[PDB]
Design a binder for these strands. Structure first.
Ligand SMILES: [Mg+2]
Ligand SMILES: [Mg+2]
Ligand SMILES: [Mg+2]
Ligand SMILES: [Mg+2]
Ligand SMILES: [Mg+2]
Ligand SMILES: [Mg+2]
Ligand SMILES: [Mg+2]
Ligand SMILES: [Mg+2]
Ligand SMILES: [Mg+2]
Ligand SMILES: [Mg+2]
Ligand SMILES: [Mg+2]
Ligand SMILES: [Mg+2]
Ligand SMILES: [Mg+2]
Ligand SMILES: [Mg+2]
Ligand SMILES: [Mg+2]
Ligand SMILES: [Mg+2]
Ligand SMILES: [Mg+2]
Ligand SMILES: [Mg+2]
Ligand SMILES: [Mg+2]
Ligand SMILES: [Mg+2]
Ligand SMILES: [Mg+2]
Ligand SMILES: [Mg+2]
Ligand SMILES: [Zn+2]
Lengths: 93, 50, 46
RNA sequence: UGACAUUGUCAGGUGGGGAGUUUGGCUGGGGCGGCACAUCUGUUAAAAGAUAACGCAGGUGUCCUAAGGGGGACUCAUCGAGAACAGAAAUCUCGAGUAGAAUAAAAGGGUAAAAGUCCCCUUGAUUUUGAUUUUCAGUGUGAAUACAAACCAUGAAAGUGUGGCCUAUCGAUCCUUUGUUCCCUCGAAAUUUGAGGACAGAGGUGCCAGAAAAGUUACCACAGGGAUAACUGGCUUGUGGCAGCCAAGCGUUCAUAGCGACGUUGCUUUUUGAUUCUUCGAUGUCGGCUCUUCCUAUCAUACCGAAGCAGAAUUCGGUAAGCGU
RNA sequence: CGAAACCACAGCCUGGGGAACGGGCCAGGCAAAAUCAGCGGGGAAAGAAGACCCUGUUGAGCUUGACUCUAGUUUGACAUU
RNA sequence: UCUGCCCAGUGCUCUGAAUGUCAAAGUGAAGAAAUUCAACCAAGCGCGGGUAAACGGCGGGAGUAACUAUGACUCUCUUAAG
RNA sequence: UCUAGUGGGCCAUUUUUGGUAAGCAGAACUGGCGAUGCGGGAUGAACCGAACGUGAGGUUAAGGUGCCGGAAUGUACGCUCA
RNA sequence: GUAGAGAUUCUGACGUGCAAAUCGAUCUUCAAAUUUGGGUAUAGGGGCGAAAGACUAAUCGAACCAUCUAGUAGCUGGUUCC
RNA sequence: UUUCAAUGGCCCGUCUUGAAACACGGACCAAGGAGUCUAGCAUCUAUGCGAGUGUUUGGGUGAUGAAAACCCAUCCGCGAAA
């Protein structure tokens, strides 16, 4: 849905424990490090013979992910995360 | 499935039947006489080769 | 029958897939017209 | 021939030739179909609560920065009478008007100085804790209620606000990823990278308490199942066939010689179907041939009745299955 | 001279009810030693843990652009050099 | 005695002009280094040519006829060829 | 507190829904059978009566009393010929 | 057409057989892709197949022997005194 | 004890809603024939000791006769703290 690019909300950060103005952005997953222990373990497991050693998702649906709002306090650099209901369309401002 | 016929032609019952053959047909080992001059031979037999 | 040959089986006598098989087929599947450049009755060749 | 090739190692491609494996559930048998697999409204539901069917009628996996929050002002659907312009009740005005309108999407409930319409300001759609209700095991998940500690919005104020008037609109472990801290650890001691933790979220699992998964067997196997089909008995009659009552009528004339609609009461079915009670450690399966017996719903033979000269022909009409067929 | 299958116990009917077609139960018809040769109505006669069908998180043969691999094959790098 | 039309699909076959993607290895830059980021490369590949006495095709989809479905009727795409 | 079996039910009365109907399918209430023998309904899991230690006597329920068969070929008033 | 080699029909006999495939009659072939002794080779996902999933010692849609192995069974049967 | 008379009495086991069943096993008799032992865990009970408890990993009387009885040190387990 339409969501303002700025919102004034309670700031949980230790230096601003009050309502302040925040810049709003949509959360996006980061890019999957190769050094994470689970990836190191999976790669070690997958080596050698035996084929695929763990489940792999062959399907996909429910492309309505819950929208996560990243709220950055303008001056404090403090960032907060807010969860909204699912929707097919998103637009900031 | 099983081993197909073409894959079984590797020997055994598929060898050549060579009892009745008198010898391989070959030119003559390349030797000094043929390299430099000539050598004469006489046809002794003309034979059927099974 | 299918156990015997890639051409075997079926409720009519037919090959099923194309008989022109690739040059790099494994033994046991290299049957029919191997690596054929073309097929059919040629009308004038060289 | 020639430092290529070959050979060794590793890498990318190809590889039913070959291996291993899988190829949901519910289900008036199974399959096909559908989704009754996670959920909502009215009804089924028998005035507490509970309550099933592949019963009935409908919805839902969205949508909304306003359609959320506060305040104010106003009153709607229609009907009537006028003015226009010219049918057009478009617009405008005055009366009546209990809501017959609106309230995002179903239905039910709720609402009139509002919960509807318009306007002004806004982000209570926020952070944190416990208690509670529903489904319920009184576990989880979802959804919801009343509070508490903050920080805010709005209003003159009392107040109201922790999303949407209420009843639907959703997600574990592992893994990844993000946020957060003058946070903990990398175990001989340090610093810096990197990694690992604690806390709060999100990736997605709709088979919705959440495997990673194509077929075929007319060559077939095993364990079982009469919890389950074909078969097999049995039951049921929606069909069809037959028999009564009714009497508008055809039958030049006489409603029922003989025909006889619309209705209505019964019988039978040898019809597939319906069901799934017997049989799946096994009741041999159509027809024909052969052979016997039984029923009568009578084709013929015996005797009777009514319509018109006989002659006949029909009602075989009534008894009647002895005897033929 | 001399087996075997098979065998809960057995062995005459009708009707009833009943796991819906009983030899046994309930009510009737009835009922007399010991036996021989035949017969094919019945014993839902015997055989074989239904071979059809369904179920099983039980298989196998076969197929394929199922899932996951694999001999081989092909291409490159490096070594041989 | 004939062996028709169809190379779009699937196969097969030939292209390097696609470098278009890309492993390993190696090369450049940053970093203290692990490493990261860039280019570079083969085949396979997308294209393109050929091929039916290769597999095969020589019409398909459709919504709707008294239980339902229905293929009557309603209509088109026709396509590689009809 | 610990633990078993169980997690196929079925019949009737009454209230029902689906179905043409069904010795049909699905729900509500209670009583039952399953796990219940016994007297009765000739017979019969569920209907009526009644629920059971081994016995004597008495009396009953439901149901009976011509004979089979224990018990009036009892009493009263009618009806009925198939 | 005989010897030999087969095995069509009677859907004959037999069908607890003479026999785990035989007997009778009938029939096919009978100078060659003929029939056959002995020697020899091919071995189990293997062989061998004028192709029936045929044949591979009464065993074949994967022989036979021992072992893993008392394989597992949400399934069937049984489970011993008052 | 046998037999007769009168009255009653279906074939057991099993799965099952329901078996006398035209459901399966059972011709007969003997002998054999199926909840065990072990590593744990949980409740309950008994016994010893108790803020402790546990001699049997070991070592000793020991050689006579010694798989037993009996004795003996340091650790350690569990408990005394979350
Ligand atoms: Mg094959
Ligand atoms: Mg396979
Ligand atoms: Mg579930
Ligand atoms: Mg699951
Ligand atoms: Mg066949
Ligand atoms: Mg079939
Ligand atoms: Mg076949
Ligand atoms: Mg049944
Ligand atoms: Mg049954
Ligand atoms: Mg019997
Ligand atoms: Mg069986
Ligand atoms: Mg008496
Ligand atoms: Mg015969
Ligand atoms: Mg055992
Ligand atoms: Mg075994
Ligand atoms: Mg008796
Ligand atoms: Mg039971
Ligand atoms: Mg029994
Ligand atoms: Mg049974
Ligand atoms: Mg059985
Ligand atoms: Mg038996
Ligand atoms: Mg014994
Ligand atoms: Zn802040």
């Amino acid at each position: 849905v339409n969501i303002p690019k700025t919102r004034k909300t309670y700031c949980p950060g230790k230096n601003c424990r009050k309502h302040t103005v925040h810049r709003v952005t949509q959360y996006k997953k980061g890019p999957d490090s190769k050094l994470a222990q689970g990836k190191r373990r999976y790669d070690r497991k997958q080596s050698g013979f035996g084929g695929q050693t763990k489940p792999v998702f062959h399907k996909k649906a429910k492309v309505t992910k819950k929208v996560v709002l990243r709220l950055e306090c303008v001056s404090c650099k403090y960032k907060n995360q807010l969860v909204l209901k699912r929707c097919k369309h998103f637009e900031l401002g | 499935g099983r081993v197909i016929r073409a894959q079984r032609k590797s020997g055994g019952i598929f060898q050549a039947h060579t009892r009745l053959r008198k010898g391989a047909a070959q030119l003559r080992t390349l030797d000094f006489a043929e390299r430099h001059g000539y050598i004469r031979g006489v046809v002794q037999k003309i034979i059927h080769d099974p | 029958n299918p156990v015997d040959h890639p051409h075997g089986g079926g409720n009519h006598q037919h090959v099923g897939h194309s008989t022109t098989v690739p040059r790099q087929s494994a033994p046991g599947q290299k049957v029919g017209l191997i690596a054929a450049r073309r097929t059919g009755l040629l009308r004038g060749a060289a």
